[PDB]
Amino acid sequence: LDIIEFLDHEYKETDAKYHFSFDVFPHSDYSAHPKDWLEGLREVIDHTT
Amino acid sequence: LDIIEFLDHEYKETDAKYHFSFDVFPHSDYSAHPKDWLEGLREVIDHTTQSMKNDYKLYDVQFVIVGNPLDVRLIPNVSWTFNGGDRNADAYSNGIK
Amino acid sequence: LDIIEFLDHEYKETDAKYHFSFDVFPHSDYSAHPKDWLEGLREVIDHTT
Amino acid sequence: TTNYFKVKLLDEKLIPFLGLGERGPRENVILSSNDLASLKQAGWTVTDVQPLPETGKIKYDRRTVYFKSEGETGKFINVPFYINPVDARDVLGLLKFDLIKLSDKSVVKTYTAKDIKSEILSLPTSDLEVNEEYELKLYFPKDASENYDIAISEGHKNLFERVKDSVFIKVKEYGKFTGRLVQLQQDINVLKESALPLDKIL
Amino acid sequence: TTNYFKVKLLDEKLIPFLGLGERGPRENVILSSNDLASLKQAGWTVTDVQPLPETGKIKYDRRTVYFKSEGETGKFINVPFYINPVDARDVLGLLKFDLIKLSDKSVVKTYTAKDIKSEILSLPTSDLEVNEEYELKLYFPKDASENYDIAISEGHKNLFERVKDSVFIKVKEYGKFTGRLVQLQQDINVLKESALPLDKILGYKDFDTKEVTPVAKENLLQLLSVNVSDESYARYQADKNRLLFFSKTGEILVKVIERSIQDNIVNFNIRILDEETIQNEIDKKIEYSVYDPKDGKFESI
Amino acid sequence: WARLALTEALPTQVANKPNFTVPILTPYVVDADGNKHALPESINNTPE
Amino acid sequence: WARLALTEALPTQVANKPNFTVPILTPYVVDADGNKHALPESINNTPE
Amino acid sequence: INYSLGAASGTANYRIIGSDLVRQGELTIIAIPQQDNYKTFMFYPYTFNVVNGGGYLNTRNPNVPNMMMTRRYTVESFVPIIGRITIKNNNGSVYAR
Amino acid sequence: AKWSDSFDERTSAAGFVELGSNVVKLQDNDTLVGQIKYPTNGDGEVET
Amino acid sequence: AKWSDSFDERTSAAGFVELGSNVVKLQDNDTLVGQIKYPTNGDGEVET
């Protein structure tokens, strides 16, 4: 519980250099399965990497 | 009947801790076949049990789901199978379980 | 013809207990090829069944 | 259903899941669902459990093009929106609509999301300007998070910093003339180093 | 591009592809593309070739639901439409919009499709009526085909009988109340053969100001999926808002569920009792109230 | 004429007498008031 | 009759006594200023 | 696979750790180099000693015998390579709107 | 139960109140004990 | 059938009463008996 305390303080001192946010709620002009909208999370990870 | 009288009473004393809903009417921006929309029930259930293994920290579980056998019909979503039936080849609910 | 008047009479005795419609016209936000909207007939005569 | 609840804690031992101090019976304590189920289970008298709006989405495509004519009387563009897990609370007085003109970052007019009846936003286009991009947001104001004890980390996003949705209204001229594009001058003879405008040839 | 052209024929031998007679130099002769290319190739001086509108489609979903409130100032619904292969001709004065009220088949107002600028139809909703289906069509009038010599067969469809597109506007009440669906009366005791309305047993707690006003206005009742415990004991009328207490008497659970707001599961423990179930316990001083259906108020003695 | 496959819908047992009867067996539960209730339908609702 | 399957939902334990009790064990932390909180659910948080 | 999982994507390999102690609504990506020259993060478990009695005074009440235990450690970030993904609206209500 | 100042939570009036998981049941020696706690008006959550 | 103070329940008037599955068939030895319950009024079902 100190490591997660550490990384939250250690990320906040970088002033949000990587805050690439994902949304589970899909887009209004998405019009497909929200279960297949969650492969977009694998692209925000690869963009953050 | 006492088992069913138990569970809605033990859910009532939990005060709606796990009350994730699901709509059979798809969302207005779904725009596809609603038989494929009922793969949404499986990702509410898996969102429900992962909420149960996170507030009680238990990991060797075998969940059971009890329901009317008309709302559990939304879970498998099995397709039909045609065979050209007739009266002499009559299977009165043979392999339906 | 007597069986059809029979089944008309017996369904009138149940006072529309098991009566669900099915629209061949898809919904306005359906937005696909209406050849597969008739798959939804089999999900109503599995619901009534 | 959500995972953010505005509750009223009524034990005075020491509130866990929060900062240093903060021990008394506290109200307006915005908790998570992982948070709240670890206090109901912890023998706390946590009451007045109200769910909080985590859905501020707009039922509208983002980058739309709105061809505006010269004479514009009324012609309200209707924007569908929905804020799901609430009907009328103290937080819905804080949810704000705004028409940000993206050219110079100033609002044209603002609406509160709980006074817009029937979940349909009728934006007037009599005030919109031509060839200038706009923005319609669901931002919480920065002075909304002050009156609540949010139980977050340093680097986590609180609720008021979380829910927003923005669309982009492009307002340009209509155009699309009616014509066959006839010529205006036959036998076009020009000099060697010169420039000829199109409004005198066609 | 289309396959229908309003041309001006200028030979006087005999016009083929048409009826008996009709030999002179004829104008306004609506031809096909298979027709016209068999006259340009046939050495005819067919001129003034103008394409004709074969696209009268509406860029809008057909069966829409429009929830209309009480106070309606403006609130124009915008309908996108496009008529492609024309800009301004004599036929575009014939293309008509119309708001057919489908209840009694009468138009509310009509528009000409060439005067509606910017290809956006702003239908007002101040004149629309509630719970009545509407229709918005692109019909040519039946007196439009008279002034042209259309080169069709008997059983073929001419151009004015061809292009149309219709959508369906459902205009109903908005509803969707704000409340937790609170009860209005504990210890529901009813007689054996009677009927109990829902507006005297349950209300809703308004969130703006905490009022306990009942469900009097009826466009909220369709969201209330009332569920009784036993089918043979009682039954909820859907057209009305009443429960139907039959000959069987005892305990029933009436589960009122509202689908919009989460956790509106309301439970009523209703006791059905006979005529002489009252009199054998009025002497032993069991004081409680039994619903009186002749006046609506709950009475004890 | 039309073709007739609709008579194969209902099960057909050929009769042998123009007038005959069939019994039904329904169990009951009395309620100490004499009012018997038909059994396997009246215990199919969960507020027992 | 309704074919039943609710007996397989809950786990069965045939009881040899008509009345018994079962204990539950829970640790605590006395917070260094007096009173106590339940242990395995009060330590679950990044702002501990 | 909901707690320990390894992904081999096109940009890098991964090692996904699922622990329920972190607050839901986020993700965290942490760089670990291979060579011992470069160092992003390091964990330093120094010591851990339990003492039973041992003459250590107790602070709640001194008059009672007292077992005691501590654990010294530190965490260190030389270069701050960390990535925070906000996961919006994961309440399971994607199918109940 | 029902106090003189309780809150109903199924009505917004001073009526009865149910007991969720804190029912005052019958323990040994056939006695009832209960440390239950009941609300006043639920907007305030006074909770005496 | 139609008694003196009956109710139609097809129109809202004192009219003919439909016998829903309680019709008096011709029983044995050509006699017909029936225990018939009929609605008396509309919403306020007296049920003579």
C-alpha dihedral sign at I11, I13, I16, I19: positive
**What 3-state class would DSSP assign to E106?**
strand
Q: If you write DSSP's letter for every residue of E10-40 in order, what string do you get?
A: ---S--SSS-SS--S--EEEEEEHHHHHHHH
For residues E44 and E31, give the distance between their C-alpha atoms in angstroms, rounded to a whole number: 14
Name the phi and psi angles at D119, rounded to 5.
60, 30
The reply to whether residue H2 touches residue B50, judged by beta carbons under 8 angstroms, is yes
Asked if E212 and E202 count as a contact pair (C-beta separation under 8 A), the reply is no
Residue with tokens 């409680």, as numbered in its chain:
E288
Helix, strand, coil in percent for chain D, rounding step 5: 10, 30, 65
The reply to whether residue D17 touches residue G45, judged by beta carbons under 8 angstroms, is yes
For residues I13 and E184, give the distance between their C-alpha atoms in angstroms, rounded to a whole number: 9
- In sequence order, what are the residues at sequence separation of 6 or more whose Cβ sits closer than 8 angstroms to the Cβ of residue I27? I33
Q: How many helices (H) does chain H have, and how many strands (E)? A: 0, 6
For residues J16 and J10, give the distance between their C-alpha atoms in angstroms, rounded to a whole number: 9
For residues E40 and E37, give the distance between their C-alpha atoms in angstroms, rounded to a whole number: 5
Cα E28 to Cα E85, E140, E146, F5, H11, distances in angstroms: 18, 17, 11, 57, 68
Q: If you write DSSP's letter for every residue of G6-45 in order, what string do you get?
A: GGGTSPP---SSSS--------EE-TTTS--EEHHHHS--
Asked if D23 and D14 count as a contact pair (C-beta separation under 8 A), the reply is yes
A1 — contact with chain G (CB < 8 Å)? Answer: yes
> What strands lie across the sheet with D106-112, from one edge to the other?
D63-68, D168-173, D132-137, D96-101, D106-112
- In sequence order, what are the residues at sequence separation of 6 or more whose Cβ sits closer than 8 angstroms to the Cβ of residue D46? D7, D8, D9, D10, D36, D39, D40
DSSP bridge partners of H29: H83
Name the phi and psi angles at E81, rounded to 5.
-145, 160
β D168-173/D63-68 pair status = parallel
Which residues of chain C make contact with J21, given a CB cutoff of 8 A?
A: 13
The reply to whether residue B20 touches residue H93, judged by beta carbons under 8 angstroms, is yes
Asked if E11 and E45 count as a contact pair (C-beta separation under 8 A), the reply is yes
* Count of D-E CB contacts under 8 Å: 40
Q: Which chains touch A (3 or more CB pairs under 8 A)?
A: B, D, G, H
Chains J and H touch (3+ CB pairs under 8 A): no
Which residues of chain B make contact with G10, given a CB cutoff of 8 A?
A: 3
Asked if D122 and D159 count as a contact pair (C-beta separation under 8 A), the reply is no
Find, among B27, E66, E58, the residue nearest to D78 by Cα: E66
For residues I11 and C4, give the distance between their C-alpha atoms in angstroms, rounded to a whole number: 53
D154 — contact with chain A (CB < 8 Å)? Answer: yes
The DSSP secondary-structure symbol of J16 reads P
The DSSP secondary-structure symbol of B8 reads H
Asked if E187 and E288 count as a contact pair (C-beta separation under 8 A), the reply is yes
Asked if E227 and E259 count as a contact pair (C-beta separation under 8 A), the reply is no
Closest chain E residue to the Cα of J39, Cα to Cα: E193
Alpha-carbon torsion angle E214, E216, E217, E219, nearest 10? 80
Q: Could you give the count of Cα atoms lying within 13 Å of E161 in the half-sphere of its Cβ?
A: 9
DSSP bridge partners of H71: H48
Q: Identify the H or E element spanning D121.
A: strand D120-123
Asked if A26 and A37 count as a contact pair (C-beta separation under 8 A), the reply is yes
**What 3-state class would DSSP assign to H1?**
coil
Cα H88 to Cα A36, D107, E179, E284, H26, distances in angstroms: 16, 26, 28, 63, 8
**What 3-state class would DSSP assign to D146?**
helix
Asked if E194 and E233 count as a contact pair (C-beta separation under 8 A), the reply is no
H69 — contact with chain A (CB < 8 Å)? Answer: no
For residues D54 and D5, give the distance between their C-alpha atoms in angstroms, rounded to a whole number: 10
Residue with tokens 């309003």, as numbered in its chain:
E6
State the amino acid at position F44 in one-letter form.
N
Residue with tokens 């059938």, as numbered in its chain:
J1
F33 — contact with chain B (CB < 8 Å)? Answer: no
For residues D54 and H24, give the distance between their C-alpha atoms in angstroms, rounded to a whole number: 14
Asked if E240 and J43 count as a contact pair (C-beta separation under 8 A), the reply is yes
Closest chain B residue to the Cα of I22, Cα to Cα: B13
**What 3-state class would DSSP assign to D175?**
coil
DSSP bridge partners of D32: D4
Which residues of chain D make contact with E208, given a CB cutoff of 8 A?
A: 88
Q: Which chains touch D (3 or more CB pairs under 8 A)?
A: A, B, E, G, H, I
> What method was applied to determine this entry?
cryo-EM
β E4-8/E27-32 pair status = antiparallel
Packed helices B42-55 and D33-40: angle between N→C axes, nearest 10 degrees: 50
State the amino acid at position D7 in one-letter form.
V
β E132-137/E168-173 pair status = antiparallel
Asked if D62 and D166 count as a contact pair (C-beta separation under 8 A), the reply is yes
Strands (E), chain E: 4-8, 27-32, 47-51, 63-68, 77-80, 96-101, 106-112, 120-123, 132-137, 168-173, 188-190, 194-197, 224-228, 242-245, 251-258, 266-272, 290-291, 298-299
- The two three-digit tokens of residue J20, written as one number: 């829903």
Asked if C39 and B33 count as a contact pair (C-beta separation under 8 A), the reply is yes
For residues E93 and E240, give the distance between their C-alpha atoms in angstroms, rounded to a whole number: 50
How many CB atoms within 10 Å of residue G24? 4
What do you get for the CA distance between the two ends of chain J, in Å?
14
Residues in I whose CB is inside 8 Å of some CB of B read: 20-21
β E194-197/E242-245 pair status = antiparallel
The reply to whether residue B29 touches residue A34, judged by beta carbons under 8 angstroms, is no
DSSP bridge partners of D66: D171
Q: If you write DSSP's letter for every residue of D59-95 in order, what string do you get?
A: SS-SEEEEEE-SS-S--PEEEEB--TT-SS-SSTTT-
A22 — contact with chain D (CB < 8 Å)? Answer: no
- In sequence order, what are the residues at sequence separation of 6 or more whose Cβ sits closer than 8 angstroms to the Cβ of residue B57? G40, H20
Name the phi and psi angles at E228, rounded to 5.
-95, 160
- Minimum distance, in Å, between the CA of residue F8 and any CA atom of chain C: 10
Chains H and F touch (3+ CB pairs under 8 A): no
Cα E105 to Cα E108, E111, E135, H80, J43, distances in angstroms: 10, 17, 9, 72, 35
- The two three-digit tokens of residue D30, written as one number: 């915005």
- The two three-digit tokens of residue B4, written as one number: 């069913």
B33 — contact with chain C (CB < 8 Å)? Answer: yes
Helices (H), chain E: 33-40, 276-279
Name the phi and psi angles at B63, rounded to 5.
-65, 150
Residue with tokens 């469900």, as numbered in its chain:
E215
Chains G and B touch (3+ CB pairs under 8 A): yes
Stretch 40-79 of chain B: residues touching chain F, C-beta under 8 Å: none
Cα F21 to Cα C5, C10, F18, F24, F25, distances in angstroms: 23, 20, 10, 10, 13
Residue with tokens 């507020």, as numbered in its chain:
F47
F41 — contact with chain E (CB < 8 Å)? Answer: yes
- In sequence order, what are the residues at sequence separation of 6 or more whose Cβ sits closer than 8 angstroms to the Cβ of residue D177? none
Residues in E whose CB is inside 8 Å of some CB of D read: 67, 69, 74-78, 87-88, 117-118, 120, 122, 174, 178-179, 206-208, 261-262
- The two three-digit tokens of residue H1, written as one number: 């696979």
C1 — contact with chain F (CB < 8 Å)? Answer: no
For residues D113 and D58, give the distance between their C-alpha atoms in angstroms, rounded to a whole number: 12
Asked if D95 and D114 count as a contact pair (C-beta separation under 8 A), the reply is yes
To test the contact with chain D by mutation, choose from A20, A28, A29 the residue with the greatest count of D C-beta atoms within 10 A, namely: A28
Chain centroid to Cα D22, Å, comes to 33
- The two three-digit tokens of residue A27, written as one number: 């887009």
For residues E13 and E24, give the distance between their C-alpha atoms in angstroms, rounded to a whole number: 7
The reply to whether residue H12 touches residue A49, judged by beta carbons under 8 angstroms, is yes
Asked if E188 and E197 count as a contact pair (C-beta separation under 8 A), the reply is no
Strands (E), E113-265: 120-123, 132-137, 168-173, 188-190, 194-197, 224-228, 242-245, 251-258
The DSSP secondary-structure symbol of C32 reads S
E70 — contact with chain B (CB < 8 Å)? Answer: no
